[PDB]
């Protein structure tokens, strides 16, 4: 009740009334009202990172959020937060940064009190116990154990080779060894450390809150003033440190790191002082816009033209409060690693060429106009994630610009541009090279993660080759942008309008699905395409030239369309199994120009030979490093291969890259674009005549340049799914080569897509959503990766289980069967009211309107590419869902999912590691020693008839 805001800055497109305030204990509180919301939410941000751990015990803040979800004194049940939140269509999650920790949830229509008081007890008074500390560190061990092979090792190696007396050189996760094994090796208690950590830091003023309410902006202000008033200010000042961790002994240095997956990268690290205080001029975003910018005559395009560099991201990377980095991070080609000194020479060539002319007024004016237009039409936000974001930046800004963060800029002061532009000098460089060519050359190794590297401090030869004489190459500044938008007129709703996209064109070449946007009224309209070809996936060779051609098209068109991607017009062009794909979205004004240029660059396409010879190798080293990936990800991929009519392995395509040559690929594009068929939806703010004009220009350009003919309707076909026998127990194991964990995915297949049988599997997969997490991970501690839900491929729906762990996989499959039996025992015991609570939770989870325009375009397109065309399946299906009995779910269970079931279909994939409470009797498994033979002797399901 200290401070109340009158009205703050909001974009005039929004309708959500706001209110900011501050409580008696110095908590920054933000209030969001929404009359038409459907899932309310709230969040919190304690301004304490993992950079305030004590030196003896490492990773208390992460272990503390990880231990805080379980158990309070006003609710002694272990899961009452998670159980009540999952009974009401909600989900809770949290993480720790180096500086702060986010706590956030979302909840159903009006259940604010019964979940806010549960989220509040979180900080009022928490209670832990022996059990939780005993079975929680195993999940934190799996947490570290998934990242011991994760190359995102480079982070801790940047943390390591700095100032070892500095608080930046600290470890965030804990690996069961620093958390558990060290403190009882020397008798240090953990619970006292946790109560001291929490009572010292977390309970103070530091945290800020935000709540996304439905009712009013006065109904809930008196609600949050009586509900978070207990947490008491301990007057803790914010931890900060003016001394940057990089002292001059470890500057001007060039390490050499060895990865696990075959990559080649070059990191150029500069230290700069703090520029978070200057959030109005933002010099770092200016230099990020001028250094890391692809296009005509810029830093990237010359290194492309010399064959050294694939891509390079510039910008300024944040750090702690006292210091801040500046990075130009590059990737490398095969012969890019020979010329690193010349690469960084060109980088200082472009720096000095941007230092000779310095500041520019019109680049600032352009960027400020672009951020103002990008702020004025900010699309709608999902209420979970958004309040965590706007609680996550609430510590820095006053009440008026809580929203207008990195969108509005007031002044262009070139003096700070010159300050940050002088700190980029080759006496401030720290080069870091990552290459798998350093197998036997590394002296030093990391203890925490186990990576190997060197110390080659650069002698002054190459320093006084960098800064000696720097006139120019052929660089220039970027020119005037032409994809900036000017037409912002919402076209009036057509007299004939449809709530669902309607077939408007139907020819043997194409078909359309069109809807003018009725809900959102934003001057932007996405549009996407699905081209079909029977020659795109015929054999590995024809499934492999497709990615090479398509990729080189994106390569040769980035130079053109990066200004469109910077102005607000984004495209995406990738391949699919059946044919290729296209999706162009963004502001409504410059869609034609872009789509047209994409088509005429698609059909009339030549091949630059050195670019092809680079991309071929950059794909050959992107196939064969699939073996260095998760065991359970191998398991999901393995199931797809054995459960589809045709699929080719990752060993086939890298075998058939020993045949792709320039003339072969060069004759392939006239074979792919000779006969084809187009399917598309157009969505957003467009008239119907302009929709027919869009498809007209598209198919007329393909007619004009490609000599495209329509396909016969008998060769518009899909793939089918193998039908398992009425009684089945299929399994075959493979061995992950580089990960020390095991993994498993087991598949229970029911049936085809019906309107009376999707609610059986969906309700049974909602009745086991919370218990499966609690029994497998919270209790039995089978690992960190627990997931169980409906899988739908080729229409045929099945319920699966994804779980990967240290344990041997058949132990997992037995304890899954035990969970099934215990689950049906808990189902037959449950009362009517909890069953109607689960039905209401699924009737709220599924009957939920999308907020963003792409969130309904991905609702329409994702079913139009499945050839079912059922747009009203969100209403009628859930109108059938309301009339179900507990007995009907038990019927679904007995003959389909049970162990004694007559109609029981089950296939299993075991991925095991490098060196590998009453379970029931299980039938002897049948081993699949050959994938093709297994598919041959089995029938295939029929395809789904359209609506």
């Amino acid at each position: 009740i200290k401070r109340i805001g009158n009205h703050i800055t909001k974009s005039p497109e929004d309708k959500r009334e706001y209110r900011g305030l501050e409580l008696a204990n110095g908590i920054k509180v933000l209030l969001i009202s929404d009359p038409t919301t459907d899932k309310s939410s709230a969040a919190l941000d304690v301004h304490i990172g993992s950079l305030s751990d004590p030196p003896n015990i490492a990773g208390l803040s992460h272990f503390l959020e990880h231990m805080l979800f379980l158990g309070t004194k006003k609710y002694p049940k272990e899961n009452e937060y998670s159980q009540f939140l999952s009974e009401h269509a909600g989900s809770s999650n949290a993480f720790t940064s180096g500086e702060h920790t986010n706590y956030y949830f979302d909840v159903s229509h009006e259940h604010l009190e019964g979940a806010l008081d549960r989220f509040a007890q979180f900080f009022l008074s928490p209670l832990f116990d022996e059990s939780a500390k005993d079975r929680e560190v195993n999940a934190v061990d799996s947490e570290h154990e998934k990242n011991v092979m994760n190359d995102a090792r480079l982070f801790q190696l940047e943390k390591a080779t700095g100032n070892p007396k500095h608080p930046f050189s600290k470890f965030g996760t804990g690996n069961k060894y620093t958390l558990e094994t060290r403190p009882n090796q020397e008798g240090i208690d953990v619970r006292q450390e946790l109560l001291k950590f929490h009572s010292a830091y977390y309970s103070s003023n530091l945290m800020a809150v935000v709540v996304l309410g439905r009712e009013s902006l006065d109904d809930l202000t008196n609600l949050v003033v009586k509900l978070f008033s207990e947490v008491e200010n301990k007057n803790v000042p914010l931890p900060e440190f003016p001394e940057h961790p990089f002292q001059e002994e470890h500057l001007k240095q060039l390490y050499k790191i060895v990865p696990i997956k075959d990559i080649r990268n070059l990191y150029v690290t500069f230290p700069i002082p703090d520029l978070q205080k200057y959030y109005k001029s933002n010099p770092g975003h200016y230099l990020g816009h001028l250094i890391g910018h692809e296009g005509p005559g810029s830093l990237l395009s010359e290194l492309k033209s010399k064959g050294w560099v694939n891509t390079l991201v510039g910008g300024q990377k944040e750090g702690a409060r006292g210091f801040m980095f500046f990075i130009i991070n590059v990737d490398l080609t095969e012969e890019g690693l020979l010329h690193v000194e010349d690469i960084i020479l060109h980088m200082f060539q472009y720096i000095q060429k941007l230092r000779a002319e310095g500041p520019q007024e019109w680049v600032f004016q352009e960027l400020k106009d672009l951020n103002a237009v990008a702020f004025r039409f900010k699309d709608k936000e999902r209420p979970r994630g958004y309040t965590s974001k706007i609680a996550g930046i609430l510590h820095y800004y006053p009440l008026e610009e809580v929203l207008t963060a990195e969108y509005l800029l007031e002044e262009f002061r070139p003096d700070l541009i010159e300050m940050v532009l002088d700190k980029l000098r080759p006496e401030n460089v720290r080069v870091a090279i990552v290459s798998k060519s350093f197998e036997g050359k590394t002296d030093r190794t990391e203890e925490w993660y186990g990576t190997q590297y060197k110390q080659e401090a650069i002698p002054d030869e190459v320093i006084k080759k960098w800064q000696n004489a720097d006139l120019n190459g052929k660089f220039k500044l970027p020119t005037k942008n032409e994809f900036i938008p000017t037409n912002f007129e919402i076209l009036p709703l057509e007299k004939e309008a449809t709530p669902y996209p309607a077939l408007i064109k139907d020819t043997a070449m194409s078909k359309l699905w069109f809807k003018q946007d009725d809900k959102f009224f934003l001057p932007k309209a996405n549009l996407n395409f699905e081209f079909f070809s029977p020659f795109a996936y015929v054999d590995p060779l024809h499934s492999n030239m497709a990615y090479l051609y398509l990729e080189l098209l994106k390569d040769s068109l980035n130079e053109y369309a990066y200004a469109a991607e910077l102005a607000g017009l984004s495209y995406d062009l990738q391949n699919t199994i059946y044919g290729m794909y296209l999706s162009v979205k963004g502001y409504n004004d410059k869609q034609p120009i872009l789509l047209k240029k994409i088509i005429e660059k698609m059909a009339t396409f030549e091949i630059d030979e050195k670019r092809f010879e680079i991309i071929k190798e950059a794909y050959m080293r992107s196939l064969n490093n699939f073996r260095a990936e998760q065991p359970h990800q191998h398991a999901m991929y393995y199931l797809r291969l054995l459960m589809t009519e045709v699929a080719w392995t990752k060993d086939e395509l890298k075998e058939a890259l020993d045949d792709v040559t320039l003339p072969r690929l060069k004759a392939f594009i006239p074979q792919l674009l000779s006969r084809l068929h187009i399917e598309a939806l157009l969505h957003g703010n467009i008239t119907k005549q302009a929709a027919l004009g869009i498809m007209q220009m598209v198919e007329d350009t393909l007619i004009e340049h490609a000599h495209t003919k329509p396909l016969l309707p008998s060769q518009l076909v899909r793939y089918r799914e193998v039908q398992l026998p009425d009684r089945g127990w299929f399994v075959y194991q493979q061995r992950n080569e580089v990960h020390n964990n095991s993994g498993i995915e087991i598949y229970y297949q029911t049936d085809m897509q019906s309107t009376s049988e999707n609610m059986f599997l969906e309700l049974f997969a909602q009745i086991i959503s919370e218990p499966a997490f609690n029994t497998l991970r919270t209790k039995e501690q089978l690992g960190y990766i627990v997931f169980s839900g409906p899988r739908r491929a080729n229409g045929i729906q099945g319920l699966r289980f994804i779980i990967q762990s240290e344990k041997p996989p058949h132990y997992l499959e037995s304890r899954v069967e035990a969970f099934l039996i215990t689950m049906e025992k808990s189902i037959e015991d449950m009362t009517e009211e909890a069953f109607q609570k689960h039905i209401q939770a699924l009737a709220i989870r599924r009957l939920d309107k999308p907020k963003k325009l792409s969130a309904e375009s991905a609702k329409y397109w994702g079913e139009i590419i499945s050839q079912q065309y059922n747009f009203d399946r969100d209403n009628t299906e859930v109108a059938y869902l309301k009339t179900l009995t507990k007995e009907d779910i038990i019927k679904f269970y007995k003959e389909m999912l049970a162990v004694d079931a007559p109609r029981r279909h089950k296939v299993s994939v075991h991925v095991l590691a490098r060196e590998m409470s009453q379970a029931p009797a299980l039938p002897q498994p049948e081993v699949i020693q050959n994938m093709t033979e297994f598919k041959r002797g089995l029938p295939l399901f029929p395809l789904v008839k359209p609506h």
């Binding site: 993992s50 990880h66 999650n93 949290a94 993480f95 965030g172 996760t173 997490f773 997931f787």
Partner: peptide
């Protein structure tokens, strides 16, 4: 980036 319950 140390999320709880992973994702998906």
């Amino acid at each position: 980036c140390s999320l709880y319950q992973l994702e998906n």
